[PDB]
């Protein structure tokens, strides 16, 4: 719809996974190596509910990109896909609220 700078990816994770040490770190790795396949990624932020401390909303990860170009080509392949068995909703996020960390 419109490229900004940051790329958001939700409906692809669950608190039942972002609650373990190796499990949570697992997604962080795959998600990082994946986003860094179309271009360069500044960083990534993933929720980590402490024994269910941040479950409320948990399940939404985002990635800080460097160039909107590789960002476009990024979701152009990981959109509507399946991180495991569910569709992944990708929505271009703005560096504004992103840094605001309105999520976690």
């Amino acid at each position: 719809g419109h490229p900004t700078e940051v790329l958001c990816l939700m409906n692809m994770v669950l608190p039942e996974e972002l609650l373990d040490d190796e499990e949570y770190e697992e997604i962080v790795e795959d998600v990082r190596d994946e986003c860094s396949k179309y271009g360069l990624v500044k960083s990534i932020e993933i929720p980590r509910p402490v024994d269910g401390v941040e479950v409320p909303g948990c399940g939404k990860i985002f990635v800080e990109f460097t160039s909107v170009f590789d960002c476009q080509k990024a979701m152009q392949g990981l959109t509507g896909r399946k991180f495991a068995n569910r569709v992944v909703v990708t929505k271009y996020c703005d560096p504004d609220s992103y840094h605001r960390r309105d999520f976690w």
Partner: peptide, 13 residues
């Protein structure tokens, strides 16, 4: 890459 689990993300297209 990875450590225990295998890579099986994005499966549709």
């Amino acid at each position: 890459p990875s450590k225990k689990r295998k890579r099986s993300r994005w499966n549709q297209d």
